[PDB]
Amino acid sequence: AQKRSEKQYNDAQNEINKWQRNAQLALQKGDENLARQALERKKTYTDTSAAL
């Protein structure tokens, strides 16, 4: 179970990293929506990660 939680935690961390890459892409793109989505997703994930 501990290993499973770690894997889930790792996935959340990976998702945040993926979102960060998207955010970098968003800045070049200049689209407000893409940047906003990444920031919101990162915050909830961080809270979830803390709980995990």
Place this chain on the structure above:
Amino acid sequence: DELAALKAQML
């Protein structure tokens, strides 16, 4: 968040 986004958009 919007203010932060605007700075990012400037790139």
